[PDB]
């Protein structure tokens, strides 16, 4: 039966918010995996590790804010398994940055589909919520990752171990 | 290809540490679920929600320290899916505390088996690591949860919603 | 069974109750020694201060074991605290020698407790003993040995000047 | 005879040794009560704090009498500290009632000691008891009576809510 | 005649502690040698020199703490000659780092054998002492040297004098 | 040839390597002396502190000579550091006398090194030795002589009181 607070909140939107919660936790897990890959003694790029650990905690905050939104609107949180990332070995600083760029575009596409649904269901509170707290965050994150990929490629990564070392010091440090 | 840092680190220990990483992340997920259950408008116990959120972040720190240990010893992190918690609806403040008690004793049993393995493989760095950073933390967490369950029961929970309200204010507040 | 109890053998629980009693007994011995040096015919105030501090430390040792018993779900059963074996501690040197003997006795009990914890595969308890008790005992025994050595080298107990000057310069 | 002893009857000296033992016994009762409320199946942390503080106070009462014994030239003879009469204090209310009974017993002992000091014309000792012990006992008994009254009015011991809220609001 | 403080301290443990004192002093001497090699005018890597001098002083602290332990337990210190290091010319920053890694694993192996002995003689004060003050310090030192070796190799050392110069500035500086 | 080397004889370079070893040996002697006074059957903490400070000073002496070797373009060749000639230093007085003998031996080696620098017309090296080593040795020898004198006048080594009081008042 209906939550006493629920108003103008479609059940499709409620379901889509539960899917987005899972996706944000999955992104947190990907970045956690990347972080400790750069902590391996045979990789040993500590500012890559720090950068991705920070990204990982950001994604957990993204998930928690969606959980708060679900309850604010009177929907009900249903959590699902968080799938392990698709790689165990992220190969290089460049490959991890390219993988993170791909991940952030995938998350952005999911947020755009969620906004389209909120628009279709005439839910301006939800569409404003997505715009305010997620859409520009995604644009900034994608732009930053693109910048990082560009610099690593221009410096000669991944073949140049010196390039990744110096990028670790000067851009992520 | 052995890690250049690896010394006196059995492959069974390495595997057991990967299992413990997953279990700590699972415990983080359980407490996250419990937290936002108390944030529901039809539950609305904000200090229960705060308490379990703090516990959830603690478990993530537990997991990250084990990931650090794996790399310190030259083992290799292999992550697995984080299973969703066994309940979506935690029923009451008392039931969530009893469920957390059961979870912490299960994690403690896993840590004790890990310590037995480290002892069997004559790995005093690993057994010291478990003792120092995990075993007394578990004893303290179990004792605190037991205290909380006792007080909730004595106050009349879960039937008395007044009892859970006052416990939220006076013990968790 | 206590809802918190896990991997805690009943023999360990009993041994912890015995150790609580022994720590309280050590607190009582040091209290007795303290006020012996407060007698007008002994009158070594820094010996008195030193043993009173030791007495309060032992009470802290006991209270931490009582906390541990409840942390693990065991149940505290207290027993009489026996009076110390002397009323008159004779001299500064004899009190220090007696305290050395006491601390080695307590250390032996802690080592037996650690052996029990190891035998029962209780690493939380063995870590607790190592962390909070074993090096504290080694430091206490080393300090008392040092004190006994200095008092003997200075000419105690026969030299009342030796005990006076040790009271001022080492315990002061 | 002690070079400081003056107007100090042998009966007073003995009575002071008995009172030292009783104050240590009261410290032990309150220590036992404190850790009872620290059990995971009792779990009233401000009851535990309150009785631990009371326990340390009683140890101070004992030490002050030991100092008095030496001040007057008497000689301290310690005896076993008996264990408390209960292991399980049942409830916050029952512990408070037990502490009230204990404090009135200690007060009766101090009144008998004052009567002895009066009978032996020892005004230093009677003033010592009046100054440092008698009003302390009256205040402690009054406070415990207040606590017992509130717990009973609130519905203890049957109401676990009553003991929980008293732990927070009065002892907290 | 027995020391008045001696209790539960086997003569084999006492001897093993004297051997470990010598090994810690030997490690201090190796790092001292390495330090001033990088101070040569034809090597001239001042932060390599600083790093190894700091390591050298740490090892002297390790030795002094074991001397204190020997007296704490009532054993008797017997010092032996401190052997000169196995090289006079440490060749390169990378070779010094690889040599320090080998040294620290050797010292770790000695400490693990010492812990085994303490365990065999049921000396939990000594096993706790080793675990507390030595074993994790060795794991951290080995992990750090492994990280350093990895970066130097990735950067192109020892052939690249630029690699060692930039590592001196950015990692050790 | 080193690009920095100028007016630096190979005999001087070798003599500097010998002096590095001797300073490290002096550091080892004082380290041994330090922990001798840390034994529970010796137990003179300020003797232990004093010799540990001296030990660290000698390590600084050695490191400054290693820096000098590189400054002048010579090459450091290290040798084994021989263990000290005693394991048991017997007493505070004997340790002080042994340290006096050591410092005069080190001074003689420095004077021979200065003579070599003078013979090879190396004023940078002779100024280095004068500036950083020769007056340091004169001060160290004077201080050790003073200490030996006081210990002897006080009655050491036979008076354990003498060494105890010197530990407190001069080294404390
Ligand atoms: Cl709706
Ligand atoms: Cl709908
Ligand atoms: Cl992979
Ligand atoms: Cl650069
Ligand atoms: Cl190995
Ligand atoms: Cl291995
Ligand atoms: Cl459910
Ligand atoms: Cl059990
Ligand atoms: Cl059992
Ligand atoms: Cl007696
Ligand atoms: Cl006497
Ligand atoms: Cl002697
Ligand atoms: Cl009289
Ligand atoms: Cl009972
Ligand atoms: Cl209230
Ligand atoms: Cl032994
Ligand atoms: Cl032996
Ligand atoms: Cl060589
Ligand atoms: Cl040699
Ligand atoms: Cl010798
Ligand atoms: Cl010897
Ligand atoms: Cl004096
Ligand atoms: Mg981000
Ligand atoms: Mg996100
Ligand atoms: Mg926790
Ligand atoms: Mg955990
Ligand atoms: Mg073993
Ligand atoms: Mg003590
Ligand atoms: Mg104790
Ligand atoms: Mg430990
Ligand atoms: Mg009171
Ligand atoms: Mg009293
Ligand atoms: Mg008056
Ligand atoms: Mg180091
Ligand atoms: Mg070392
Ligand atoms: Mg000097
Ligand atoms: Mg010198």
mmCIF file of N, CA and C and ligand atoms in Angstrom, chain D residues 54 57-58 103 140, ligand 31:
data_model
loop_
_atom_site.group_PDB
_atom_site.id
_atom_site.type_symbol
_atom_site.label_atom_id
_atom_site.label_comp_id
_atom_site.label_asym_id
_atom_site.label_seq_id
_atom_site.Cartn_x
_atom_site.Cartn_y
_atom_site.Cartn_z
ATOM 1 N N UNK D 54 31.694 5.242 43.188
ATOM 2 C CA UNK D 54 31.501 4.958 44.614
ATOM 3 C C UNK D 54 32.591 4.034 45.137
ATOM 4 N N UNK D 57 35.730 5.947 45.753
ATOM 5 C CA UNK D 57 35.578 6.786 46.943
ATOM 6 C C UNK D 57 35.864 5.987 48.200
ATOM 7 N N UNK D 58 35.325 4.766 48.280
ATOM 8 C CA UNK D 58 35.532 3.950 49.478
ATOM 9 C C UNK D 58 36.997 3.594 49.643
ATOM 10 N N UNK D 103 25.603 1.290 53.192
ATOM 11 C CA UNK D 103 26.025 2.570 53.750
ATOM 12 C C UNK D 103 25.490 2.783 55.159
ATOM 13 N N UNK D 140 25.513 10.298 51.546
ATOM 14 C CA UNK D 140 25.447 9.093 50.709
ATOM 15 C C UNK D 140 24.146 8.337 50.931
HETATM 16 MG MG1 LIG G 31 30.097 7.403 48.086
#
